[PDB]
Swiss-Prot record, chain D:
Source species: Salmonella typhimurium (strain LT2 / SGSC1412 / ATCC 700720)
Entry's family note: Belongs to the bacterial secretin family. T3SS SctC subfamily.
Protein name: SPI-1 type 3 secretion system secretin
Part of the full-length chain shown: 512 to 557 of 562
Subcellular location field: Cell outer membrane
Disruption phenotype: Insertion mutants are hypoinvasive in the HEp-2 cell assay.
Classification of source organism: Bacteria, Pseudomonadati, Pseudomonadota, Gammaproteobacteria, Enterobacterales
Subunit structure of this chain's protein: The core secretion machinery of the T3SS is composed of approximately 20 different proteins, including cytoplasmic components, a base, an export apparatus and a needle. This subunit is part of the base, which anchors the injectisome in the bacterial cell envelope. Forms a stable homooligomeric complex. The complex is composed of 15 subunits.
Cited function: Component of the type III secretion system (T3SS), also called injectisome, which is used to inject bacterial effector proteins into eukaryotic host cells. Forms a ring-shaped multimeric structure with an apparent central pore in the outer membrane.
Swiss-Prot record, chain E:
Subunit structure as annotated in this protein's UniProt entry: The core secretion machinery of the T3SS is composed of approximately 20 different proteins, including cytoplasmic components, a base, an export apparatus and a needle. This subunit is part of the base, which anchors the injectisome in the bacterial cell envelope. Forms a stable homooligomeric complex. The complex is composed of 15 subunits.
Localization annotation: Cell outer membrane
Effect of gene knockout: Insertion mutants are hypoinvasive in the HEp-2 cell assay.
UniProt protein name: SPI-1 type 3 secretion system secretin
Family: Belongs to the bacterial secretin family. T3SS SctC subfamily.
Domain of life: Bacteria
Protein purpose: Component of the type III secretion system (T3SS), also called injectisome, which is used to inject bacterial effector proteins into eukaryotic host cells. Forms a ring-shaped multimeric structure with an apparent central pore in the outer membrane.
Portion of the full-length sequence here: 308 to 358 of 562
Length: 250, 51, 102, 46, 51
């Protein structure tokens, strides 16, 4: 089966928002936007501008594989934890996301050559309120939990879809001052605009295939090409070969 | 103060079965958004469930 | 690992597999290279009968994964002028890709 | 809203060509590596 | 049986992100990116680069 995710989002924020108060001769006090005079007498009115925007994009594609006989069940499940390097070694912290997967099946053969199976699958992370810093969520993407319960049959060696989910969204707001936000000269200094847009697909595929043959080439030649090139080969040692040699050829 | 707010969201699940057999689909993502500030730090998030 | 083997007539072996491998989920190794020292491998579990001809090797299950991440965080007006506009960026790519098979 | 549809056919084109157009354009393709191809090749064509 | 694992990852981080505030004549205060004036009056605006 084929998990696949696509995420894409962009967001912009621009504009000001004002507050504060003035005073006249200890006779009258004018305040803007809930600024209580009971905390301030001479602190004049302030502003606050925000400016930030970004574009986020992330993919993740994962696949489990497993085989059985026909008319017998089987279970596969898996969960790794993926760490990422928060900036700082003495100023020390970590953040991490577990990524769980589960699948159980029950296949059989048909007469004309197609395969019929019985699917319960799961995928995702557990809901964790974490990764407090801005890029800490950005480091490892999130994919929601999902669950299917479906029998589905498919012709031999080809691929059929089993379920999915898409989503599109916007957001638009223009926050401003009523009178002064429409004059042509500096009227756009009193705006506060913040768009938002994200759009995400995620779909579960499936494809079986029939298998009758042993692996070509052999597995003992696979790992001996791994260990002599990843730099961990351990047959040179004249202290440890006296007990590995009981263990490689019988 | 005055403002004008407008927002859309369109989502769709897909799933198949055979006939005369049940099936379940459910899903919930959590959507984060970037509150302004990295040392002055905070987040806010909404889960979006479907069944 | 627990098993239950038997012989066939033509010479092949049929077995009955439940296997497990991994570490328990531990929030630890707080310093940056402390996670880097010992790699992590997730937990896994199979439940499978599978037969195989004599003396040769067959696959029993696995897991692969590929991923990216891209973001360009910047200032709206001043992040596009040609001279020093790229002093206001904040880019952070990320990419990992992992296989594991039994 | 709701709308069903009847389906009898496999997906055209195949799924192995879909993701191999994803991974070579999203920038995560992992078949170039001469350290990891020795165990993915047991796993793509049988 | 043969367990086997391969892991590979790379990551890069570059760029700045700004914050802070200014003041004019104790009459007006302009702040960038959620810097509250209620904690700072003369502390001028700073930056932060990561590499």
């Amino acid at each position: 089966l084929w998990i696949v995710d696509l995420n894409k989002s962009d967001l912009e924020r621009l504009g000001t928002s004002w507050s504060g108060s003035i005073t006249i001769g200890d006779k009258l006090g004018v305040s803007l936007n809930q600024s209580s005079i009971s905390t301030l007498d001479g602190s004049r009115f302030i502003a606050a501008v925000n400016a930030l925007e970004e574009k986020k994009q992330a993919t993740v594609v994962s696949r489990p594989v497993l085989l059985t006989q026909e008319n017998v069940p089987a279970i596969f499940d898996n969960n790794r934890t993926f760490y990422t390097k928060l900036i700082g070694e003495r100023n020390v912290a970590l953040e991490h996301v577990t990524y769980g997967t589960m699948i159980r099946v029950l296949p059989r053969f048909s007469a004309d050559g197609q395969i019929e199976m019985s699917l319960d699958i799961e995928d995702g992370n557990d809901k964790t309120p974490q990764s407090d810093t801005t890029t800490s969520v950005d480091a490892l993407p999130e994919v929601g939990r999902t669950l299917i319960s479906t029998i589905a049959r498919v012709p031999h060696g080809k691929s059929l879809l089993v379920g999915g989910y898409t989503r599109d969204a916007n957001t638009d707001t223009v926050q401003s001052i009523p009178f002064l936000g429409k004059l042509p000269l500096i009227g756009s200094l009193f705006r506060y605009s913040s768009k938002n847009k994200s759009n995400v697909v995620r779909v579960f595929m499936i494809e079986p295939k029939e298998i009758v043959d042993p692996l070509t080439p052999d597995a003992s030649e696979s790992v001996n090409n791994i260990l002599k090139q990843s730099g961990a080969w351990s047959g040179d040692d004249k202290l440890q070969k006296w007990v590995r040699v009981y263990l490689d050829r019988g």
